[PDB]
């Protein structure tokens, strides 16, 4: 998000507004206002790696902007809204993640390497790789009888086409020793 | 199937280039995935976008 202080009324802010948004969901509705427009409308840029070296980015769009008014005891603990030299802003952090990871529930709650494993086992599990297996003579492949879409999910899955082509089922899991098996 | 379509193989010197490469870099933020890489062998050498 290009965030220049182009705002007379105030300070620095996203070169995009709640209007731009509704103007988008507009097209979302009837499946007019493209992404490409969000580009040419000089609203957001394709920040190269090199180029990135010379900018400042606000993590959470909002949050890291206005002033002040006791935080929430339940939430985590995030750094402040330092400086205002901000040039751009992050769409959503969840985007540093690649396919695999994006399917991991609450990756921001596990021992760093754990999220790596899941990044490999999902690539080893079963599923419904496509809905035309009925007509594919691919040498070998497995489909889970009754796949269930997961209960807990990521906003990311939405685009990864998951609730539509899951890789497992939600089983009522009981954590506990028993027979000792 | 997706995860594979968006993957990256990065050549090496000859034997495990233990250092510079394989590590997760700063410049990696936002571009490459930080957690998804192969265990051992070509670890950190093959990346997922």
């Amino acid at each position: 998000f290009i965030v220049e202080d182009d705002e007379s009324l105030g300070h620095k802010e996203l070169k995009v507004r709640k209007g731009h948004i509704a103007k988008l969901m507009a097209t979302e509705y009837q499946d007019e206002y493209t992404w490409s427009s969000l580009l040419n409308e000089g609203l957001v840029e394709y920040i190269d790696a090199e180029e990135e070296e010379s900018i400042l980015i606000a993590m959470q769009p909002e949050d890291l902007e206005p002033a002040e008014a006791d935080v929430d005891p339940a939430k985590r603990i995030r750094v402040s809204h330092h400086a205002t030299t901000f040039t751009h802003c992050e769409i959503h952090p969840s985007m540093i993640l690649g396919v695999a990871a994006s399917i991991i529930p609450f990756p921001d709650h596990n021992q760093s390497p754990r999220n790596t494993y899941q990044s490999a086992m999902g690539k080893q599990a079963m599923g419904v790789f496509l809905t035309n297996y009925n007509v594919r003579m691919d040498t070998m492949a497995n489909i889970l009888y009754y796949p269930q879409k997961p209960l807990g999910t990521t906003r990311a899955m939405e685009y990864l086409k998951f609730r539509e082509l899951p890789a497992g089922q939600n089983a009522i899991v009981a954590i506990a020793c028993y027979s000792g098996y | 199937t997706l995860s594979h379509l968006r993957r990256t193989n990065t050549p090496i010197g000859r034997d495990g280039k233990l250092a510079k490469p394989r590590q997760l870099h700063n410049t990696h933020w936002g571009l490459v995935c930080p957690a998804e890489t192969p265990e051992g062998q070509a670890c950190g050498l093959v990346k997922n976008l």
Partner: peptide
């Protein structure tokens, strides 16, 4: 107020637009 700020929840809609156009294989294709 077709030009108010933008709460987090909104961005999703943006990213949606992204793939709407781009595609999870954007790279490979183009």
């Amino acid at each position: 107020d077709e030009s108010a700020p933008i709460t987090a929840e909104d961005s999703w809609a943006v990213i949606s637009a992204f793939f709407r156009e781009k595609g999870l294989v954007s790279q490979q294709l183009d």
